[PDB]
């Protein structure tokens, strides 16, 4: 089994309610334990951010995040603003950086 614990993240100057009709909960919604980070208004520049979490507990933690590959470059600049996007993830023994590959999938 699994026990969940709040990461305790706090967002300012963006939208944290990105949802979809493919995840129905009395209308559109998203993953329960994730949040779809959106720009504060369509096509607006996404402010560069940095958030951090410490594992205080005695057993290791399962951290899961998502890189979003939008349908089109146009949609990508609609949700997160224009320009190149980059997401870097850091820990004591892990440092990878992801670039979204937008494009059409079936």
């Amino acid at each position, epitope marked *: 089994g699994i026990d969940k614990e709040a990461m305790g993240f706090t967002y300012s100057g963006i*939208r944290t*309610n*990105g*949802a*979809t*009709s493919a995840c129905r909960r*009395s*209308g*559109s*919604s998203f993953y329960a334990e994730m949040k*779809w980070l*959106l720009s504060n*208004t*369509d*096509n607006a520049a996404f402010p560069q951010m940095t958030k951090s979490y410490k594992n205080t507990r005695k057993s290791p933690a399962l951290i899961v995040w998502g890189i979003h590959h*939008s*349908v*089109s*470059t*146009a*949609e990508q*600049t*609609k*949700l997160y603003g224009s320009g190149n996007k980059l997401v870097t993830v850091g820990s004591s023994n892990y440092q990878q950086s992801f670039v979204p590959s937008p494009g*059409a999938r079936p």
Partner: antibody
Amino acid sequence: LQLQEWGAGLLKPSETLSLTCAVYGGSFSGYYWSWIRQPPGKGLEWIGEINHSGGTNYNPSLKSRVTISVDTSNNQFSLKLSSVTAADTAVYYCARGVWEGSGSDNFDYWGQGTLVTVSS
Amino acid sequence: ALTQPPSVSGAPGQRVTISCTGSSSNIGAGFDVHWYQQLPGTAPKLLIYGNSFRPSGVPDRFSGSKSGTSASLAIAGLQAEDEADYYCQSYDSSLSGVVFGGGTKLTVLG
């Protein structure tokens, strides 16, 4: 799912068009809630939308002139257009928009429509 | 920025096509195009969404598509009750919002 909007009819230029639309059979926060207008001759224009949280999505060409509020309690959402010209004479609809990413993707269950003639 | 023809003819039954021509910023991106049926004096109703998917109430007749920078609706099986105005709709990033077409007027015999 019922959808019917009421408010001001005739108003003269430089006034403030105010409308308000009521819903029956559904609930906010599942979708977006949009106002879409249609001039009497031709066309169809999306003026803006809002969600339960008060999160708006406004048409940039009508920003600084439009404000959409939401009465989460009374199952109705409003419309404020602020310095009305004669170009604003049109039919005004309210409609529910399917929330897909950022703001809505298509519109299901449109309202009925009210005419707003703005002439002097 | 969705250029539709203003008029389409048609005898009952015969298939008839409605163009929805758009630019590289609305349908020349991943934005789906949908359609809406406005019967005279009434509100619009939702026709085809997701470029082909029809909702509950729409007959086999109504069939749509999207290709390159444009879409095309097809009314095969023209009944009398299809007299209405049809609009397409998608998302334009240059306007940062949702756009409709001018509209096409569906006229039947006799």
